[PDB]
Design a binder for this molecule. Structure first.
Ligand SMILES: O=C(O)[C@@]1(O)C[C@@H](O)[C@@H](O)[C@@H]([C@H](O)CO)O1
Ligand SMILES: [Mg+2]
Ligand SMILES: [Zn+2]
Lengths: 222, 219
């Protein structure tokens, strides 16, 4: 299997520097150009630069938008791709992707990483408060029951939420975070048969990488 | 100097129907040496990375369904989707690689489906939140269509608008519905001055609002 995995994203202040890495496997790394592409939240993809393959001396090119400020490199022993960013500004806040590029024959980006989120801001890292969402003395018995978790007051993005360590997958909605007085809040709902809860356990697993927060919140009745 | 532009910015299509979208380059992408157009299409589903669909304008990548077809040449390209499926919900980007690389601005494809009423659930503040002085009340409005919806919060029968935040999900990849969360935040002191908390949803699927409520005395 081909694998590309970005790492290194997180919070940085304006004017700072930050280096992203992209670990690859499942293909002959040296045969391929590699590109970095970024995407501000809810905006379009922007190509940033590439580094060529061994046949082309591993030379680099950049978009005018970052040339002279961003530098791309590669570790050909370990098949890792790098992106060094300097003098960062708000406009640089985005999800950064690495992508496999040209091989000398095909014109395509065959594979993309999952992306790493960079946030440029002066605000401080704040861990989330995670609160269970259980029905009050409501109808409850409707063949189904909807539970949730409120993930409140964190910074920066992102957070991850799963249910029953991913075991509950269908019937889950996670609502996009909203920014308020410098803090994000989101919620997640999960829907299951009420014969199964609270007969069986339902727990939301929340992680906030910026603060290395890991939370398991069991949803308890009453 | 290769400007890429796409059209439309967005549209919606019902399942089973055809989708047509356009991509223009400020200069020809046809490479004279290889006689191919250096133009690729990518699909970015909600919450996912982009995925290669078509390259060399018309070559369909292995593992990509036949209903996706790229066409065009020179400065003008088209991606056609026949028999659209719910899962095709995505933003579609075109990208030139004739001179370095440049992406178009994307086309957002929404799926049209039959109107559906929301399923509404209300949740009182947890004891763990109240302990620290705050009180959030949450309402889920799940699996409805179309996206437009109104939520009102009433406390002891009176509407309250301040301290309310709303968030819609992206359309669902399987049932083409939306969901939305409405969260009302109060201080503990103010939460404890009132008894009834109500979230009312008005959606075009009924002239009757769907009302969910809880009373603090009953907690
Ligand atoms: O600049 C290049 O290294 C490259 O080979 C990249 C290719 O994608 C392609 O753009 C090519 C041009 O067609 C020139 O041959 O240049
Ligand atoms: Mg749904
Ligand atoms: Zn050069």
């Amino acid at each position: 299997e081909v694998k590309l995995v970005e790492s290194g994203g997180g919070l940085v202040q304006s004017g700072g520097s930050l280096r992203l890495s992209c670990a690859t496997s499942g293909f002959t790394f040296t045969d391929y150009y590699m590109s970095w592409v970024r995407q501000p939240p809810g905006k379009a993809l922007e190509w940033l630069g590439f580094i060529r393959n061994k046949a082309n001396g591993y030379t680099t090119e950049y978009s005018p938008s970052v040339k002279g400020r961003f530098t791309i490199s590669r570790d050909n022993s370990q098949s890792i791709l790098y992106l060094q960013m300097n003098t960062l500004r708000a406009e640089d806040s985005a999800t950064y992707y690495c992508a496999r590029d040209h091989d000398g024959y095909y014109e395509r980006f065959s594979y993309w990483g999952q992306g790493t989120l960079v946030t440029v801001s002066a605000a401080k890292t704040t861990p989330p408060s995670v609160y269970p969402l259980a029905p009050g003395s409501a109808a409850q018995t409707n063949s189904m029951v909807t539970l949730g978790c409120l993930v409140k007051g964190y910074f920066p993005e992102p957070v991850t939420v799963t249910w029953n360590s991913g075991s509950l997958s269908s019937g889950v909605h996670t609502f996009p975070a909203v920014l308020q007085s410098d803090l994000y809040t989101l919620s997640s709902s999960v829907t299951v048969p009420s014969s199964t809860w609270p007969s069986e356990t339902v727990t939301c697993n929340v992680a906030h990488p910026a603060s290395s927060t890991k939370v398991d919140k069991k949803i308890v009745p009453r | 100097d290769i400007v890429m532009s796409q059209s439309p910015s967005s549209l919606a299509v019902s399942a089973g129907e055809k989708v047509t979208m356009s991509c223009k380059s400020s200069q020809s992408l046809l490479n004279s040496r290889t006689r191919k157009n250096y133009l690729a299409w990518y699909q970015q589903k909600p919450g996912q990375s982009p995925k290669l669909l078509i390259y060399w304008a018309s070559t369909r990548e292995s593992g990509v369904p036949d209903r996706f077809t790229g066409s065009g040449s020179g400065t003008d390209f088209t991606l056609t989707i026949t028999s659209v499926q719910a899962e095709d919900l995505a933003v579609y980007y075109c990208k030139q690689s004739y001179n370095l690389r440049t992406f178009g601005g994307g086309t957002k494809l929404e799926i049209k489906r039959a109107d559906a009423a929301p399923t509404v659930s209300i949740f009182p503040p947890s004891s763990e939140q109240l302990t620290s002085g705050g009180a959030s009340v949450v309402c889920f409005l799940n699996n409805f269509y179309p996206k437009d919806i109104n939520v009102k919060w009433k406390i002891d029968g009176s509407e309250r608008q301040n301290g309310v935040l709303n968030s819609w999900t992206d359309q669902d990849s399987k049932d083409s519905t939306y969901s939305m969360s409405s969260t009302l935040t109060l201080t503990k002191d103010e939460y404890e001055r009132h008894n009834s908390y109500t979230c009312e949803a008005t959606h075009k699927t009924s002239t009757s609002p769907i009302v969910k409520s809880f009373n603090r005395n009953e907690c």
